[PDB]
Design a protein around this ligand. Structure first.
Ligand SMILES: [Mg+2]
Ligand SMILES: [Mg+2]
Ligand SMILES: [Mg+2]
Ligand SMILES: [Mg+2]
Ligand SMILES: [Mg+2]
Ligand SMILES: [Mg+2]
Lengths: 357, 357
């Protein structure tokens, strides 16, 4: 069931936005057709984890089926706010990460009839739509203000996180707009500390905290949960998820994943890189520095091999297990006063722990 | 005087954002200092006509000196919201328009130490700072919701206008993501009707309507004015402003302007091009078609010559006159019920009409 009504609302939403364009922005049917394809391609075909989580939270907490309908519909709308938000990021990220492929098909910027400049802007329409749907559907809702603030906070934080990511390979001390600079040769910034920061901000907020929050908001239950504990859950779960993403980038075949990995080529401060650099021999570190941040497939393979040789699958297992127990305890801390919420967090973790995506 | 306080508030705003980044986002000094440079370079050095308008509306409309202080400070914050919004759009426009230079210096994405990926994200940071500064300064402010909503609406409209601009040279009939397509060779879409659509949406709203409205809101005076007339003015003054932009792109020396024109090279649907094409001989038109949308300087120079030869300067003078008096009529309608507001609108017409910039 969750999915049936979700897609039901996708169509309401989509209809509202396109019709609004035609009626109020003087839009010709070609561009309207174009933007429909852009919407479907950029927003559909994922697993909808963030949007579904919102609904799930709404459901779990509603422990006069008219309220039920209102809460569930709102939850769906928030659900798509996040998915459209996600979509926006992904459109821009792929350009920034110079990716080729996404969800089994070419990156939006790589579609044959999509110029790079139009993709950038298509990415922005996407973000605007999150506001547009919110304003329409929640016009007369006493929570729209708070909703919108929180949502802008997360978005900002995500943007900030992306700065961390996109500059993780330059020596921060030499980071000056006026002066050109090459990629770091010493990698002194590839530390777990910096890794954790990138990920907390680029991924944990919008992927884990935000959907929990929006589910609570549409259900008028925000004050009923330990937020400090809710926030730790999200920070932990989101870090692990990003770490999973980093591993898959490297070691999962693109056909399962939907996308070809660029973290090595782009010289990303991935979990692998940082965990590798902290335990590795000088000899290994040296071979790494010699092969990292390069298009060349042999170099890419070498980096992959160093990772295998340094037994990073060792470290991952241990990290994972360590995440799982902290998560288990915090869920129980939350179950004391918040049982319904706590169950949906458990489901969310269910979808994370050992995901094969 | 207005300018004295506007820059005090800039510091205030800047000091708040950067400190937040430090205290709440775990930001290191290097990135902090990068972000300060980015902020200054993208938000300063222009003329601030959008920002200053807001204050002037505020000041006009005032008709215990503490409300005055509150309303004025609020107006500066609003003024910077639009200037930061403008800042965002320009970072992204310059990339999309492939421009070289802006406000006397290289485009942000062209700064030696700014990568393209990072500029795109810096533009997004700029946008989010409009929300954040609002959230902060207006937290206890009954109008914050109305403001954010109106602001988002306009922002979205600008994005829609930008799509009109960026696709204006493709046969819209063939516009499909899945299939590549070269520049239109027939230019059927280079009509004044389509031109008017581009410009209404990409420039008029944020540049003219939005400063006026913001001034009204913080003055708590929105309902005192004929909004349908206000909008008429803004659309008019906005179209004419963009017509002026298009012309200078072509015939103003880069040094007076602070930027190099790209409209010819980008094959943009500028006012000149529509105006030329509707009146030129078939021969002239063939020539234009041979030379438009190419970086080659001789081809670029030919086009310039075609525009001069077609006496577009007669068409401009006429348009200006018609606009000028159509505006004058509408101001007087407005002066009737709201003479304080109407004055600030005339001040604003005063900074547009015959601008050299
Ligand atoms: Mg990335
Ligand atoms: Mg990526
Ligand atoms: Mg990845
Ligand atoms: Mg443009
Ligand atoms: Mg431009
Ligand atoms: Mg221009």
């Amino acid at each position: 069931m969750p999915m049936q009504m979700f897609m039901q609302v996708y169509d309401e939403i989509q209809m509202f936005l396109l019709e609004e364009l035609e009626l109020k922005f003087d839009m010709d049917p070609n561009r309207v057709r174009y933007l429909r394809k852009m919407m479907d391609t950029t927003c559909l075909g994922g697993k909808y984890n963030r949007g579904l989580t919102v609904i799930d939270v709404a459901e779990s907490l509603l422990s006069d089926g008219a309220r039920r309908k209102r809460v569930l519909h709102d939850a769906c709308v928030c659900g798509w706010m996040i998915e459209f938000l996600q979509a926006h990021y992904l459109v821009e990220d792929d350009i920034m990460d110079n990716s080729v492929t996404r969800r089994g098909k070419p990156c939006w910027y790589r579609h044959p009839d999509v110029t790079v400049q139009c993709a950038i802007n298509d990415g922005l329409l996407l973000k605007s739509w999150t506001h547009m749907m919110a304003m329409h559907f929640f016009a007369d809702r006493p929570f729209l203000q708070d909703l919108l603030c929180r949502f802008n906070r997360v978005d900002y934080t995500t943007a900030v996180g992306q700065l961390y990511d996109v500059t993780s390979m330059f020596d921060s001390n030499k980071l000056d707009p006026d002066v050109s600079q090459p990629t770091t040769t010493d990698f002194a910034e590839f530390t777990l500390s910096n890794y954790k920061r990138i990920v907390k901000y680029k991924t944990a907020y919008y992927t884990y905290l935000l959907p929990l929050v929006m589910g609570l908001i549409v259900s008028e239950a925000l004050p009923t949960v330990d937020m400090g504990v809710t926030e730790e859950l999200a920070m932990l779960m989101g870090e692990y998820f990003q770490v999973q993403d980093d591993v898959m980038d490297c070691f999962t075949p693109p056909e399962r994943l939907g996308k070809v990995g660029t973290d090595i080529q782009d010289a990303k401060c991935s979990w692998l890189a940082v965990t590798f650099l902290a335990k590795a021999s000088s000899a290994q570190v040296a071979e790494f520095k010699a092969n990292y941040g390069s298009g060349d497939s042999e170099k890419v393979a070498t980096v992959r091999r160093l990772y295998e040789e340094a037994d990073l699958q060792g470290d991952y297992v241990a990290y994972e297990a360590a995440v799982a127990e902290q998560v288990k305890e915090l869920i129980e801390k939350l179950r004391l006063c918040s049982p319904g919420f706590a169950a949906s967090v458990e489901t969310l973790w269910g979808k994370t722990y050992k995901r094969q995506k």
